[model samples]
Target: MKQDGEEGTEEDTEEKCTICLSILEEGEDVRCLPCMHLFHQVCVDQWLITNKKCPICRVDIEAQLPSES
Candidate 1:
């Protein structure tokens, strides 16, 4: 006897934002860090405004931050 349980509509293989804790959907505004880490544009911007580090790898974004001379 064979039991075939077919699942409908496979889930997307997208990454989720650690900041907002939400799925990263296609066409959504996002930002990529030097460490290759990704996050929502607003999410990362909000974070960078206070912290200059990657949330996932904790990579220093200080050098990449805006230069205000």
Candidate 2:
């Protein structure tokens, strides 16, 4: 068989907060980290305040800054 032409870059489209293990609902307060992962605002805020890294990928959240509009 031919080698899988594409890398497994596809991600779960049904985004959810792994912290609370709940689906991210529309119009809900959420935070998108520097690693491009999404989570509940309160959840991730509290998490970073303590750990300073993404709970999922462990990316350096403290080393990144939010984009300016």
Candidate 3:
């Protein structure tokens, strides 16, 4: 509803990151492209180092990264 980084009124959206609740804070938000899941950047980064998938959707981050080629 808020279109990712854009700001929106309460009526425009109802979804929020389960990890921290409330819309992510600007650059602090880590958006998972495949699953469209949002989370604090640091929180996601730390989780990713140990876990291979998104916390909510379980989308694989490693597979999404561009290949070395």
Tell me which residue pairs clash in candidate 1: none
lDDT of the candidates, in the order given: 0.65, 0.68, 0.57
The ten-residue window of minimal lDDT in model 1 covers 5-14
lDDT per residue, candidate 3, 10-41, as tens digits? 53223465545556655544654345565666
Q: Model 1 off-target regions past 4 Å?
A: 1-14, 63-69
Cα lDDT tens digits, model 2, 1-69, are 442233345485336677668666657767776676778888876887777776777667684487756
**TM-score for candidate 3, residues paired by index:** 0.47
Provide the lowest-lDDT 10-residue window in model 3: 11-20
CA deviation > 4 Å runs, candidate 3: 1-14, 20-23, 26-33, 63-69
Task: Quote the lDDT for 35 in model 1.
Answer: 55
Local lDDT at 64 for model 1: 54
Clash number for each model: 0, 0, 0
Candidate 1 on 1-69: residue-level lDDT in tens?
643333456342225677678656657677765555677888887888887776766777774554437
The local distance difference test score of model 3 is 0.57
Count: clashes, candidate 2? 0
Candidate 3, clashing residue pairs? none
Top-scoring candidate (TM-score): 2
User: All predictions: root-mean-square deviation over Cα?
Assistant: 9.5, 9.4, 6.9
What value does the lDDT take at residue 18 in candidate 3?
56
Residue 68, candidate 3: alpha-carbon lDDT: 40
